[PDB]
Amino acid sequence: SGFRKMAFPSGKVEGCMVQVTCGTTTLNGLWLDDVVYCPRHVICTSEDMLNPNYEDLLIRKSNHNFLVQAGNVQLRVIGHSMQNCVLKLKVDTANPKTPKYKFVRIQPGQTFSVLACYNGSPSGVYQCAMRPNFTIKGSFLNGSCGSVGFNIDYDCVSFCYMHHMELPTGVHAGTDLEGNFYGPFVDRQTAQAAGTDTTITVNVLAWLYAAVINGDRWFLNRFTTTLNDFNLVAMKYNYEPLTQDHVDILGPLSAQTGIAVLDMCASLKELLQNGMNGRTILGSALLEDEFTPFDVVRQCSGVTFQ
Amino acid sequence: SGFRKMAFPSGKVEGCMVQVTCGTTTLNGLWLDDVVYCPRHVICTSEDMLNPNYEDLLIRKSNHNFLVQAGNVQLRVIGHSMQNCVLKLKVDTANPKTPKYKFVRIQPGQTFSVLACYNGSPSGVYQCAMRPNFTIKGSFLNGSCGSVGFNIDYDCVSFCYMHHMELPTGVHAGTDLEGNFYGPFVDRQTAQAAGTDTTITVNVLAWLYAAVINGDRWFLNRFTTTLNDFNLVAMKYNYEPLTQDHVDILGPLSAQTGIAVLDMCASLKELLQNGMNGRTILGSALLEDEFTPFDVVRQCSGVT
Numbered sequence A: 001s002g003f004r005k006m007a008f009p010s011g012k013v014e015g016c017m018v019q020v021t022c023g024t025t026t027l028n029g030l031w032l033d034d035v036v037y038c039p040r041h042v043i044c045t046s047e048d049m050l051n052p053n054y055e056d057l058l059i060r061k062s063n064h065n066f067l068v069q070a071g072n073v074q075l076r077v078i079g080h081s082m083q084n085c086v087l088k089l090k091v092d093t094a095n096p097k098t099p100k101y102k103f104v105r106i107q108p109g110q111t112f113s114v115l116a117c118y119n120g121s122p123s124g125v126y127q128c129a130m131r132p133n134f135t136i137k138g139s140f141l142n143g144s145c146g147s148v149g150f151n152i153d154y155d156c157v158s159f160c161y162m163h164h165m166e167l168p169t170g171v172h173a174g175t176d177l178e179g180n181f182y183g184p185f186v187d188r189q190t191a192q193a194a195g196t197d198t199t200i201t202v203n204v205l206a207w208l209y210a211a212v213i214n215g216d217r218w219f220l221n222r223f224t225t226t227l228n229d230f231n232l233v234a235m236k237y238n239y240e241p242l243t244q245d246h247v248d249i250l251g252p253l254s255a256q257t258g259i260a261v262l263d264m265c266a267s268l269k270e271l272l273q274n275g276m277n278g279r280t281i282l283g284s285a286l287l288e289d290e291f292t293p294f295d296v297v298r299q300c301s302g303v304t305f306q
Numbered sequence B: 001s002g003f004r005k006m007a008f009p010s011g012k013v014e015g016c017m018v019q020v021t022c023g024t025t026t027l028n029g030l031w032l033d034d035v036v037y038c039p040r041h042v043i044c045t046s047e048d049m050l051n052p053n054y055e056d057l058l059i060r061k062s063n064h065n066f067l068v069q070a071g072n073v074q075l076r077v078i079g080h081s082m083q084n085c086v087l088k089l090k091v092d093t094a095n096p097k098t099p100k101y102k103f104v105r106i107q108p109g110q111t112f113s114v115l116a117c118y119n120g121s122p123s124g125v126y127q128c129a130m131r132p133n134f135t136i137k138g139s140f141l142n143g144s145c146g147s148v149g150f151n152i153d154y155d156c157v158s159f160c161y162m163h164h165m166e167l168p169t170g171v172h173a174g175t176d177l178e179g180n181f182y183g184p185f186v187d188r189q190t191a192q193a194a195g196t197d198t199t200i201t202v203n204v205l206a207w208l209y210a211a212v213i214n215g216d217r218w219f220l221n222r223f224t225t226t227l228n229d230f231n232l233v234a235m236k237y238n239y240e241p242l243t244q245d246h247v248d249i250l251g252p253l254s255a256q257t258g259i260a261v262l263d264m265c266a267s268l269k270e271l272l273q274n275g276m277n278g279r280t281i282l283g284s285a286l287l288e289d290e291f292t293p294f295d296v297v298r299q300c301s302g303v304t
């Protein structure tokens, strides 16, 4: 009963957060096995940030320029390389709290939990989604860089995000754990702007299903729609196109409630055209697009992690 | 910048969660030192739950009736006792991952993080407020009982909540860790309902401060109200009265933004009376009341 924006339990990631210092710049690193991953801009001074030559700056560094701290313990750095926009520091000690993990690159619309860290110490956990414009709507201050996003698959932590920067209107950008940016952003102090964001239609439909499961039904109507007619209306409200794959992915949720996906789409179409008329769904006065179909199943069926 | 509903990191609590089974009932327990704490209704069958004579039921239980599992490891139960609605199982092994901890009773309006668990395994985490009517708006399925709510201050875990029940409306009730219910609810199968809830005015103001700090300032106005005049209006909308102590507590946020509390109150008066006119605040079309002043300060200053 009840429906909440809900993050993965973070303990397995907390055990991997360290502090990385290079000169006068401190931020967070991820310690897995005998490697520490962090944003490469830990090697810049403020005066390099406008147009840094990172390859050049890294040559000028030595293993001893990197101070890595896990709690009170300094970890000795015995090697360093750069992959895309992440720095990899080889340390002499493997992290005893390393979980099973992998690195994945997620797609727009997928969700993940963020463990916000400052000086290598976990501060908070929240859920968000990779927006269609490749930003995230996070909560990050100075010091947070190197905070990671992740999912848990049973006992396996999939890391999908590492935090690097803030963009106009207070949204955020970063890389996968191979150091490739999501979207066309670059790690430098330069005017950049995200494109117009859109609403993740498949997620909105998942959340309408969550609403019905939790007993909110008023928006169900007597109509169906074709996929084409649905998209004609949705394009007009800055919604992502709903594809046949999305329809097929919502099928388990449709079986659980007895409401066919295209019947749900006809209800959404009416909500977009007529508005909510002052009314709420699962306590919200707007349509929520940061639960995937899997997040809804997970929450409404209590899938667990260890 | 940015502003999110943010839970505390849950790892210190995860290392304390165990599965407790008694006959056909399994739920979660909290393992601190050599004690496992869990809801006492773990000892009931379905028939028992009409009006359980807890003392009588517990007398008839054996230590051996309690299967406690921590990962792949059974803990041997060597004693049992009851404090109010919580069962304490003494086990022969102290939890090596016991963090520094206290048990606190929180006040309506205050927030905490919930680690929702099933079969002793962490499932997810989220933030709740103790509502003025002594419920929480959680997310809990069968098997969730024994999941805890907590705050972390530095390295100390303050356990404030343990989950026992759902109510009509899809809200939730539970106890502190001494096993006293928040509100007038009881641990038996009986028709129970939450009172009328109210809006946590002081929290709405904290959040409007959060909005300003993050640059969402369209709802600020040049007007000011008196405290009494503010309360005359807001109480009609079923908001809690704002007291001078509330005003005092908002002083840090007021000082940080430079907007006096009674200046901000005129914004809130206008938002209540006229709505948002299709605008949003921090992405919300409704006024949010589950962030405390401290939550805002924590997230907007970045304590760890």
Ligand SMILES: *[C@@](O)(C(N)=O)[C@@H](C[C@@H]1CCNC1=O)NC(=O)[C@H](CC1CC1)n1cc(F)cc(NC(=O)OC(C)(C)C)c1=O
Pocket (backbone or CB within 6 Å): A001, B026, B027, B041, B049, B140, B141, B142, B143, B144, B145, B146, B163, B164, B165, B166, B167, B168, B169, B170, B172, B186, B187, B188, B189, B190
């Ligand atoms: C569990 O004991 C548990 N094992 O997880 C609780 C879980 C609830 C089930 C779904 N979500 C929950 O929060 N609690 C109960 O089942 C409690 C038991 C407490 C009272 C001793 N409980 C027992 C009942 F007999 C009935 C209810 N609630 C209820 O009927 O609510 C309706 C909304 C369905 C009317 C209850 O919570």
Ligand SMILES: *[C@](O)(C(N)=O)[C@@H](C[C@@H]1CCNC1=O)NC(=O)[C@H](CC1CC1)n1cc(F)cc(NC(=O)OC(C)(C)C)c1=O
Pocket (backbone or CB within 6 Å): A026, A027, A041, A049, A140, A141, A142, A143, A144, A145, A146, A164, A165, A166, A167, A168, A169, A170, A172, A186, A187, A188, A189, B001
């Ligand atoms: C970071 O390096 C860290 N140490 O935590 C991180 C933190 C951000 C600051 C405030 N919130 C954050 O998420 N990043 C930066 O400061 C990055 C540097 C990255 C790109 C190389 N950075 C630097 C900078 F000089 C400016 C910005 N952004 C910015 O000014 O945003 C607006 C919206 C004002 C254009 C930036 O992100």
